[PDB]
Amino acid sequence: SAGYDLSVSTFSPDGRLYQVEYIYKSINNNNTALCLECKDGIICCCINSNMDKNKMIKKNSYNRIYHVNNNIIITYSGFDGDARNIIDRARSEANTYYYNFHTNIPLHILVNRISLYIHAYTLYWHMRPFAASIIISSFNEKDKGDIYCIEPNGACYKYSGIVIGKNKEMFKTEIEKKDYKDINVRDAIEDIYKFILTSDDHMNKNNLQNLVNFSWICKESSYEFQNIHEEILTPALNKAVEYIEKL
């Protein structure tokens, strides 16, 4: 503020980066993206409630969950173009790592490289910083699950469950009521549907099935990226709607 918030390469007299703070506001105003580590896998869900008034969009065509090596989930909250750019860079880093060493890039190395890539755009007076928060997650039998969230300022932190975007406070409060380290992903789907219905006021039983993206990496999917099939999602949606209608 006071002329100190017009550039990302100037600190304010109190050592703050107002451009990055404004990016944080933009991300918080965007669609919801959560990742949850369960007993047998990780579930990634994206609630695109901002498109509740776009009735001519092809059903389920808009997806915010991607994979890197078929075993690393990556989702985002923010600008679609910026997130796509960052995901392309993540895929590029994975490709280079495999070319160099003939193995898949470790998740923490990829997270660090993506954090550096994002942080590089907050340093110069002629580039626009990325307005996106990234979630990068993986799961396997030995190591269980690893979830990292990268903020627009280049800070990566590890979690067992993370929510970014709108209503993230309510989503976190509802998620923290139970320990999912001892719950299976199939049982967690119903809980996530209930959380969405209670938290997001723009979401109802009618639009739950076309404004929500659901992917996972679990034992059922052979610890590889999968989109949760409608045959598995529909019963959970029905049960959640039934329960919330009961109360």
């Binding site: 075993n71 490709n95 495999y98 070319y99 590889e224 999968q226």
Partner: protein, 256 residues
């Protein structure tokens, strides 16, 4: 690469009623020295495509890594099974690579076979792709795939490329190719295809110094890409005049 140092010998690929059968011996030679006897010369690009090579192992490995990363990018961008690249697409990619390297006069010392199934209507293997776990290794019948839905393509050092019902590289282009141009027929069963390939490999083992009888067979079918258990081909001589002792021949003249 100025020339070949460690090399692999011929590969043979053919079409049969259920898909593609491709065979190569598991030997790489460092000149006349058979240094490596358990080498893999057939690689899986995706669930419907394989690549075989004859020539320099280093250049073959370079190309294999290129194709592996191309497949990974394809899988990253895939939304439906129709989005997966086809053997024709990979054949075009390899042909373009070879052509550009010819123009630069920096060639890959290799002859390449790109084989597979040019269709998505015979299975749902690409609905959920697994890269690090092979569920194949729970048995349903194979699907009779139309010959026009299968693809075998050849690329050489100068970028010359084409496709056919059967492709051979290396020394196979003489022995196996003669036998195939004589005896190959459409819609062969698996056992008939294996018998024909085994005859070709036996002739190659007898008449080619850089070959072995330790054979790798790979099948591209509706079940996906299957590697068979490598086996030793039985190869016995076809004449007793070979075994006849030399001391029983007349001691005068040039009887050797």
């Amino acid at each position: 690469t100025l020339g070949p140092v460690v090399t692999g010998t011929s590969v043979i690929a053919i079409k049969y009623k259920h898909g593609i059968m491709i065979a190569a011996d598991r030997k790489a030679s460092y000149g006349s020295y058979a240094k490596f006897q358990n080498v893999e010369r057939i690689f899986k690009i995706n669930n419907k495509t394989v690549m075989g090579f004859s020539g320099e192992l280093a250049d073959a490995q370079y190309l294999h890594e290129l194709l592996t990363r191309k497949n990974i990018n394809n899988l990253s961008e895939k939304k439906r099974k129709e989005d997966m690249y086809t053997p024709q697409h990979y054949h075009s990619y390899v042909s373009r690579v070879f052509y550009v390297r010819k123009n630069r006069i920096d060639p890959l010392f290799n002859n390449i076979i790109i084989a597979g199934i040019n269709s998505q209507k015979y299975d749902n293997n690409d609905d959920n792709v697994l890269l690090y776990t092979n569920k194949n290794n729970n048995n349903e019948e194979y699907k009779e795939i139309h010959k026009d839905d299968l693809y075998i393509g050849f690329v050489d050092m100068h970028g010359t490329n084409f496709c056919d019902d059967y492709i051979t590289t290396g020394y196979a282009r003489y022995f196996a190719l003669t036998l195939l141009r004589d005896h190959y027929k459409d819609n062969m069963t698996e056992e008939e295809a294996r018998i024909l390939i085994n005859e070709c490999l036996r002739i190659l083992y007898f008449r080619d110094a850089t070959s072995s009888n330790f054979i790798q067979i790979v099948k591209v079918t509706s079940k996906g890409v299957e590697y068979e258990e490598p086996y030793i081909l039985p190869c016995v001589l076809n004449s007793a005049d070979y075994v006849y002792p030399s001391t029983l021949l007349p001691p005068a003249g040039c009887m050797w």
